[PDB]
């Protein structure tokens, strides 16, 4: 058989591969670079624009644009370059051969799916397509049918409660805190220690400081006192040029804004209170199964100690006879792709695809008809 | 094909030849001599003025003018004589036959290119012309696409950072220390030992003492103490008339003013600190590649030990995890010409020439439009 593609556009990373594989063939940043300086040498083989690992490699010459932000595609001519690179250069497969599966954050604009569909059939000429809610796929990955899923990548965070494969749309919470807003906060706070980062090519440095050094405090105000009193907590990092920077009590302050969006001036409650309020909107027969199956998903949940901090601060809210368990598998950065990889391999699914014969009759609005 | 001429006017030397050659056909000093005494014999075949190797040969009778100083052409009626000599007498080729390529220091006055262009099309009637930044050609010569180039001839010194053939104009440093100001310093310092040199015809002697005897100290104040305490360092030179002079601790003091322009009363920092500051103006992603590819270029970098002194005193500034390499090929006095010789031979370049049909439409200002 022709296996289908699974392509988790996400934001910030593209994850792609064939259904039935256990990890993606292609993981590269969803970033398009254009050169800003004057090219002076002649015969250099100048190239209009760079995608992914190239734009990361040459980033010092480039201006880097993400075409997707908050799970919304904001520039289609970039995004189509990213798909073109994914199919032809990175997977080295012609998409006209076999179906494609795409993933989207819930509750985002209706036109985004119509444009994705129109591009997939018109330019890439895919034989059939489907789009699937990421947080649903995270359950397929973690091997469950009853869950509440905190799925948090770059761009967007959302909670979806699912009971025995019935989703509860009225209870779906979406929040726009994400790895990119922890990064922009880490930029505005590192400045306290004099370090400075003003360009995209070094926003990509701060993005990797955040990944290695940052961690989540099990209780915030005592570690704030500790690392204000003893320097033993602070750690140091070599910038690309060889300068050494040092980061102390800061390296737990940026991921803790997930629990206090007030630090960046948002009104809304952190991931713990939005998780609890999402459970509270569910009807009371299912709350015990939701409290047991809290599933972490996506990369922004990778910070050390976010599991124990969640279990603590939800147990501070839950009724004390209940039992609260946070399921944080180590693969979890890929779980949306793994779930889509198994979903697309199910023989039952093969009916679900939007085929081109349907699209040519109904137009791109068919998605709202046949998808979720 | 008609090969193009490459004519690196420089200052002090003219280097000229055909594109695709590996060394210039013509290397002669860019010097015009006029006779100052009364000519007494009759029928001698007296001649108004001499160019190049003639004015060097007869220099005792002449006043010698350089028409170019600090990479600016200051007398066009001299310079056009020098070009006339280059094409017709030294290469023995009519410039109306095939294109010509010319080289210029960066950041010098805008009108210099307009005058060069106007003279090349109007009087010499060249079919096509181009002007190229010297420090760019030194990379073509040294076989690199990523570099920072310390290019230092007579007249002018400059640093140009180039990353993968993108130049970084905001980081271009230009400095007016040069072989001519080391020469005028060597004149004002030799007076310490009583020797005296007051005329151009013996400025041309001091210019050759500087070339043979001078060298750069790896650390200045210990060699200053050594050669003040032990005479073992001093060396002797025969003037043209047969007088012997002797030079001691002096012979390292004049080239060391490249590193301490205070000795001649300039404010600015030496070539090492201007190189480092030029790297610092570059963005932090590329600095490791700039630090690795430091390229020496031009004749004033020929002093023995200038490579090791540069590597020392930049390593004193660079972050200690970096690696610092100074690339000082032995040809380097010619590398700007070799680079222009390969540049002009590239088939891709043939579009780049300013053709006369373009110039006749746009006027001499077309250079700023179509050149770098």
């Amino acid at each position: 058989e022709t296996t289908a593609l699974v392509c988790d556009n996400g934001s910030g990373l593209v994850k792609a591969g064939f259904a039935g594989d256990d990890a993606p063939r292609a993981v590269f940043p969803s970033i398009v670079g254009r050169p800003r300086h004057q090219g002076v040498m002649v015969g250099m083989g100048q190239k209009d624009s760079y995608v992914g690992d190239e734009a990361q490699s040459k980033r010092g010459i480039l201006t880097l644009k993400y075409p997707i932000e908050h799970g919304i595609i904001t520039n289609w001519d970039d995004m189509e370059k990213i798909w073109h690179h994914t199919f032809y250069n990175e997977l080295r497969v012609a998409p006209e051969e076999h179906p494609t599966l795409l993933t989207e954050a819930p509750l985002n604009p209706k036109a985004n799916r119509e444009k994705m569909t129109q591009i997939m059939f018109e330019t890439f000429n895919v034989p059939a397509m489907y789009v699937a809610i990421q947080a649903v796929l995270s359950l397929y990955a973690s091997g469950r049918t009853t869950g509440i899923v905190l799925d948090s990548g770059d761009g967007v965070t959302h909670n979806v409660p699912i009971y025995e494969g019935y989703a509860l749309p009225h209870a779906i919470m979406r929040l726009d805190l994400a790895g990119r807003d922890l990064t922009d906060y880490l930029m505005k706070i590192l400045t306290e220690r004099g370090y400075s980062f003003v360009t995209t090519a070094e926003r990509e440095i701060v993005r990797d400081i955040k990944e290695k050094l940052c961690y989540v405090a099990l209780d915030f105000e005592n570690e704030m006192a500790t690392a204000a009193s003893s320097s033993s907590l602070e750690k140091s990092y070599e910038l690309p040029d060889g300068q050494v920077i040092t980061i102390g009590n800061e390296r737990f302050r940026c991921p803790e804004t997930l629990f206090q969006p007030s630090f960046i001036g948002m009104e809304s409650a952190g991931i713990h209170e939005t998780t609890y309020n999402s459970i509270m909107k569910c009807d009371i027969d299912i709350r015990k199964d939701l409290y047991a199956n809290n599933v972490m998903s996506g990369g922004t949940t990778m910070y050390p100690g976010i599991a124990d901090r969640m279990q603590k601060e939800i147990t501070a809210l839950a009724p004390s006879t209940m039992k609260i368990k946070i399921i944080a598998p180590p693969e979890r950065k890929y779980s949306v792709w793994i779930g889509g990889s198994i979903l697309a391999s199910l023989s039952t699914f093969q009916q679900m695809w939007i085929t081109k014969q349907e699209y040519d009759e109904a137009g791109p609005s068919i998605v709202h008809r046949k998808c979720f | 094909e008609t090969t193009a001429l490459v004519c690196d006017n420089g200052s002090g030397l003219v280097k000229a030849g055909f594109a695709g050659d590996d060394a210039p056909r013509a290397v002669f000093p860019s010097i015009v001599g006029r006779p100052r005494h009364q000519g007494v014999m009759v029928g001698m075949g007296q001649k108004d003025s001499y160019v190049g190797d003639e004015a060097q040969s007869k220099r005792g009778i002449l006043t010698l003018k350089y028409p170019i100083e600090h990479g600016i052409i200051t007398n066009w009626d001299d310079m056009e004589k020098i070009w006339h000599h280059t094409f017709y007498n030294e290469l023995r080729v009519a410039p109306e036959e095939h294109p010509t390529l010319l080289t210029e220091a960066p950041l010098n006055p805008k009108a210099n290119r307009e005058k060069m262009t106007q003279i090349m099309f109007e009087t010499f009637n060249v079919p096509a012309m181009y002007v190229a930044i010297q420090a760019v050609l030194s990379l073509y010569a040294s076989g690199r696409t990523t570099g920072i180039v310390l290019d230092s001839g007579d007249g002018v010194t400059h640093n140009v950072p180039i990353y993968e053939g993108y130049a970084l104009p905001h980081a271009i440093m230009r400095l007016d220390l040069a072989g001519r100001d080391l020469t005028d310093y060597l004149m004002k310092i030799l007076t310490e030992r009583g020797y005296s040199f007051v005329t151009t015809a013996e400025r041309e002697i001091v210019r050759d003492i500087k070339e043979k005897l001078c060298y750069v100290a790896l650390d200045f104040e210990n060699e200053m103490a050594t050669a003040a305490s032990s005479s073992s360092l001093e060396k002797s030179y025969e003037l043209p008339d047969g007088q012997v002079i002797t030079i001691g601790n002096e012979r390292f003091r004049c080239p060391e003013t490249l590193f301490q322009p205070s000795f001649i009363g300039m404010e600015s920092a030496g070539i090492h600190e201007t190189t480092y500051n030029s790297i610092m103006k570059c963005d932090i992603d590329i600095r490791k590649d700039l630090y690795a590819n430091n390229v020496m270029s031009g004749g004033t970098t020929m002093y023995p030990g200038i490579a090791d002194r540069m590597q020392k005193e930049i390593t004193a500034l660079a972050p200690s995890t970096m690696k610092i390499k100074i690339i000082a090929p032995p040809e380097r006095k010619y590398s700007v010409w070799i680079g222009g010789s390969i540049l002009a031979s590239l088939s891709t370049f043939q579009q780049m020439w300013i053709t006369k049909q373009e110039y006749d439409e746009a006027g001499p200002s077309i250079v700023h439009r179509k050149c770098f």
């Binding site: 370090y195 400075s196 003003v198 300068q243 | 610092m280 932090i284």
Partner: peptide, 7 residues
């Protein structure tokens, strides 16, 4: 500054 720039 201490890193990103000269101050």
């Amino acid at each position: 500054w201490x890193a990103x720039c000269p101050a």
